Amino acid sequence: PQITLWKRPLVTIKIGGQLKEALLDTGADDTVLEEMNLPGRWKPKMIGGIGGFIKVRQYDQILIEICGHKAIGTVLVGPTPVNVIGRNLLTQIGCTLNF
Amino acid sequence: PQITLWKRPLVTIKIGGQLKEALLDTGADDTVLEEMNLPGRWKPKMIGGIGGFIKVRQYDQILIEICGHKAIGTVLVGPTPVNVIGRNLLTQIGCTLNF
């Protein structure tokens, strides 16, 4: 589809057998999701933006479905104010910016 | 143009007669630039990101050219980790997400 930017580009995703809402975020290097109890091992990481850094748990090779498009890759989990699908997964669904 | 997301969607912008590099950021409502001298009146404001809130100077109705596309709108100046072009200007240059 085509998504205009009048409002936040929020879409439904499916991750770990759960449905959530997330932003399609071209400004996010990596996908970051609200606190959720995913199984498997993980690695500590800190990610920075406006306001400073938050601590997140890095899970690798996580399957996510974004508008029926499947992708699998890194998912960071932590106390983020919003769920963002970052470029690491946006590339996998064929997402481009166009003007 | 059509911009893929294998690397950061960085573009050259012109603001206040100066060239700068900036990130096309669909997850940003607003446009936030690093500390710089901008001609015009400004008001102090707060803006919140992934790591908390920062103090910015709000400049209204500023001319800004993004990759050869003119916009006139609000620009926030403050200690952002990187220059981000948010939706308030992305809409003006006709930017959409497509997949």
Ligand SMILES: CC(C)CN(C[C@@H](O)[C@H](Cc1ccccc1)NC(=O)O[C@H]1CO[C@H]2OCC[C@H]21)S(=O)(=O)c1ccc(N)cc1
């Ligand atoms: C600042 C960017 C270079 C990086 N950010 C993505 C960006 O889209 C955030 C994503 C975002 C969105 C909402 C809340 C927090 C973070 N937007 C943002 O900070 O925008 C602010 C300016 O406009 C306002 O509108 C939203 C917040 C304000 S980030 O959230 O900090 C981030 C950093 C690293 C990763 N892997 C993922 C995300």
